[PDB]
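Subject: Interface between my chains keeps coming out wrong

I've been trying for a while to get a sensible model of this assembly. When I model each chain on its own everything looks fine, but I need the whole thing in one frame so I can look at the contacts. Pasting all components below, labels as-is. Any help appreciated, I'm running out of ideas.
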Amino acid sequence: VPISPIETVPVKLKPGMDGPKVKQWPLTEEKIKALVEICTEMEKEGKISKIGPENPYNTPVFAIKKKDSTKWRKLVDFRELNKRTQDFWEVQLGIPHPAGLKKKKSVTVLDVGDAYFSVPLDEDFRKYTAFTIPSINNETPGIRYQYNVLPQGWKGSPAIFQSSMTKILEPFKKQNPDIVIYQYMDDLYVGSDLEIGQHRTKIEELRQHLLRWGLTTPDKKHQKEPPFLWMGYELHPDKWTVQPIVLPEKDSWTVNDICKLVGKLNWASQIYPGIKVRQLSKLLRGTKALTEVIPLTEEAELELAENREILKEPVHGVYYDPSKDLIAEIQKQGQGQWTYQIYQEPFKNLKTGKYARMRGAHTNDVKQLTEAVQKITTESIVIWGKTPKFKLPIQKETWETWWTEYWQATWIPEWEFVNTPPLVKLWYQLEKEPIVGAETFYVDGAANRETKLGKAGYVTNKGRQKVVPLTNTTNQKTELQAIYLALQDSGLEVNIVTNSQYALGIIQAQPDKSESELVNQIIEQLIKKEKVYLAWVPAHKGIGGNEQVDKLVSA
Amino acid sequence: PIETVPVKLKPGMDGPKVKQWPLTEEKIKALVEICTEMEKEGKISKIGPENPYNTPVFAIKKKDSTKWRKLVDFRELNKRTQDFWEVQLGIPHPAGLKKKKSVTVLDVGDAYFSVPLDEDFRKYTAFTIPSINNETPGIRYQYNVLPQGWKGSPAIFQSSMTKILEPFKKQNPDIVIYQYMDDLYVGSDLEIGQHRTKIEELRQHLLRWGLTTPGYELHPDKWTVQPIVLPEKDSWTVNDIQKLVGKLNWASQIYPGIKVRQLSKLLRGTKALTEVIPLTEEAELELAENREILKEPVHGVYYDPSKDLIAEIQKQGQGQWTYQIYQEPFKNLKTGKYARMRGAHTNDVKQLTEAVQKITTESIVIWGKTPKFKLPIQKETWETWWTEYWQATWIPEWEFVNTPPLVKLWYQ
DNA sequence: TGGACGGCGCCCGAACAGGGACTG
DNA sequence: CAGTCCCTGTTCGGGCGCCG
Ligand SMILES: OC[C@H]1O[C@@](CO)(O[C@H]2O[C@H](CO)[C@@H](O)[C@H](O)[C@H]2O)[C@@H](O)[C@@H]1O
Ligand SMILES: [Mg+2]
Ligand SMILES: [Mg+2]
Ligand SMILES: [Mg+2]
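Reply #2:
Try treating it as a single job with all components included. I did that and got this:
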């Protein structure tokens, strides 16, 4: 017989499909050494088994060195078995953030020893694990082996491991309601308000508990020793920080260089306030080769300078005090870039972050502020389970004007005004009623689908008129164009009548920024006016000035 | 103890796989506790990653309640059981319900826990409980009994229900009773006291069959419509007549009788918007004959039970919200306005949330169906807050629209 | 050497969806 | 009427970061 450790989780292939037959890699003997080495050591313990050719399945395998170790780590590429294996439901729903930890008097961190290998595979499934082991190049075939436990590289390994592990920890935790255990993969963070002696008792009890299930806890455990290394962070009794971030120094930048770089900077932005990736990311747009070398703009060069400088000074986050409120304050950084700090006691930050996302062809700061407030809420709800009270650089009246008037449902949760500039505003406002004594411009434009040639023009109650010819255009653009002309040729107060739905919807949403250069100029003009009233009439109803300027811009 | 009625998903369709969304701390606590007592009562039992299927779960408090209710968002499973509860074991709809002077809604969902569930089905009721700050991986479950808020539950229990009900349907021959999912709709033309009393009677009557009742009172004969209305002015400016013609022009896709020529006439020049236009004879009459058509019915609009309801909502400002329920465009089976709901003048998402529930409810009373909503809101804005305001045990289908108001058709 | 798995985050670009306006 | 075209907005996959 072989032996059975802890309750197994049933597995299957995707019905009416069969296993992993593919030939092994031309592996360099250096690895082949390290391989048969730990291979053989398995079987004594029940991890693998030899198999009669009655097992018709083969899949390649090769080790990669374990980082920060002399030791080597074993990976079986199961990709072809994964493809044909039943789908699972991942139980890892996200990552724990340090800023979410409450303050604990005493804290232990223990890694599980050979975690995937201490967990039983499924009986009926085991066969499918079949792979074949080299000896040395050209010497012999090498023996074929079937796993008795969870292989590294299957697609089911993480979910089954985490699930089993939790099932095991349930009774201890139920036995110790006041112990906090953060369980992530095989990493355990144990903490308590116990006095360091009693606490360590419990640590030992737990190590014992995990032992009953075959789960080793070596003494490669942080005991008395702040800082603890956890999830890429350093944990201190009152503070935490990211493990130091190295940013490449390269004199000539490739595309891959900027990716590593950018992603490093996004990781950094959870604590160092004010990181900006905008101009550096601009550099990756419409490039072919990840290998290709690309030059840094004086924009992306400037950005990178201040980002490195932010990193210069050591910063740290604090922990969470459920008794006190959470506060998120937001600063506008320019070019649709936003940073925020979530804190409790002024100046002691839980975490920081940025919202840079450009959403829409035309938008404004109020919308992007709303977007960031929502980004920040969900984030908060994940980590602390509650929404921060918000401190925002937008006047309370600015906001009341926007949301009441907007045609869409919009909301910000409980929040208060902070007078830190730049303040968020609305740069212009359309009148709700036509302006007495203001010239009324009827505008239209049309364009020919085939020529892509067109006209944009206007007619007015005062007799004023214009028609402008345009090239390589569209119907929409000529309508925008007609409005632009009416804005340009008119006084500080103006009534404009368009039949364009497209143009009218854009402008009514009070954009302050656009991808379209034409919209930007329109915006630019709108800001200079004292009063603009925009009205819509249907086309081709023989309405008023609308009929006349419709004629003019067809001709 | 009972015979489990088998269930299959609609042909050539697979179970729901839908990620669980973040929960606030109070909801995770409420759920962790609810699920404990549900495990120890055998209604649900823990499971593992082997089961590929998942449905979102969260919790709510009914209107004025203060007690948490578990709510599963079964919309995706129900779409894949749709066959079953319409074609085979489904429920008939009482066209008289809407005429009653009062209708009370009771939560009978607890009853469904009695019946067990086809064992081959439970794999599909899978739902994960999240942890705050991802302390723990997800604690997964699946249902051993008829789950609340599955469309299969009130159907399988229909036989049981009718039996428990039958005595009281006979004692009270004319009181209409409808069942839509976890709810029992009950209505009478009795005065308020008689009505309330008789509800209590139905309650006891439900109790000795082993069920509770944690009731909402509607009044379908109070429910009004919101016709399209043209304004009343002593003088008309050019703007006014442009705005008017635009509206009538749009209205003409509904009421074909509408005429703009005599009103268009007033607009002939190129005139300043604020300039006053007195109204010609033939325009005064055309405007009149229009006002009258907008009083009429639309020709040939009726409800077709094979087609989905669609609900559009518009935000009118100042608390007001207008809506229209329809099956085919421009043929509206009903149109309405809401004002001063909870959150008026402070929170749109709460008001919109309130409006979607009120509208859904009328559709349940009237047609026994829920509409698919077209919501005037950004997906993220809604998806961030809607659960916070959700007071109801069902969840309609929705999609999100951006439609600027070039004309105000539905509200002056 | 070139190379496996799950989770989450950012950013990008290609592909898909649908709505209004014009064109046979 | 159907079939294009603009245009705008979503969704999805792939690249990197980070965790085991
Ligand atoms: O599923 C993607 C995304 O949409 C949601 C709600 O926005 O999906 C649910 O709602 C849809 C619209 O009613 C349903 O069609 C769908 O079946 C249902 O899952 C969320 O679940 C999710 O965030
Ligand atoms: Mg380990
Ligand atoms: Mg035109
Ligand atoms: Mg779930």
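Reply #3:
Confirming on my end. Chain A has 13 helices and 23 strands.
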